[PDB]
Symmetry: C4
Subunit: 49 residues, 4 copies
Amino acid sequence: INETADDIVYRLTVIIDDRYESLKNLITLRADRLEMIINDNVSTILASI
Amino acid sequence: SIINETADDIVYRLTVIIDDRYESLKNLITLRADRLEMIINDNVSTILASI
Amino acid sequence: SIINETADDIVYRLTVIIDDRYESLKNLITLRADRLEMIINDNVSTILASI
Amino acid sequence: INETADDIVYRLTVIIDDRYESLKNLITLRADRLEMIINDNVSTILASI
Ligand SMILES: [Hg+2]
Ligand SMILES: [Hg+2]
Ligand SMILES: [Hg+2]
Ligand SMILES: [K+]
Ligand SMILES: [K+]
Ligand SMILES: [K+]
Ligand SMILES: [K+]
Ligand SMILES: [K+]
Ligand code: NA
Ligand code: NA
């Protein structure tokens, strides 16, 4: 139960990393998106005043 | 082998818990992020067209 | 049982810990994504005042 | 085996906290990112508008 029942830590890390990397990537994507839906749009309201 | 059949249930039950919070966070961020677009395109239609 | 109580222990002890991180992450996302309208609805009014 | 194998929670809490603190730093990073861009862009428009 020592050299075998360590999967509860390891197998969960495989899960928690996948959810973390999907969270980390999605936050980065959506935040970069809003930054490209701001600096792209503010340059248009500035290009007309 | 109650050992193997138990550690698989722990990984499973926690997977269902861990997957639940990810989806809750995923939908929350996606909902909030799209809401921030609803408050960004609302100014482009207002301050560019009509001012 | 004896192994069902140690399986329910680590599952429960982690379930609230994940709920600790999840609800905390939920608070961070909500807080800041609630500020971005405080930094828009209060910021749009300045562009509406001068133009 | 004795009674408790709390290293399961321990060495997993090492993972949950590490991924959380990473996601904690990520959200705090982007929320500060869009904050400067909320200020720099707003102050940029206030010149000619
Ligand atoms: Hg065990
Ligand atoms: Hg929407
Ligand atoms: Hg910045
Ligand atoms: K990138
Ligand atoms: K669904
Ligand atoms: K609606
Ligand atoms: K044991
Ligand atoms: K800052
Ligand atoms: Na804690
Ligand atoms: Na905490």
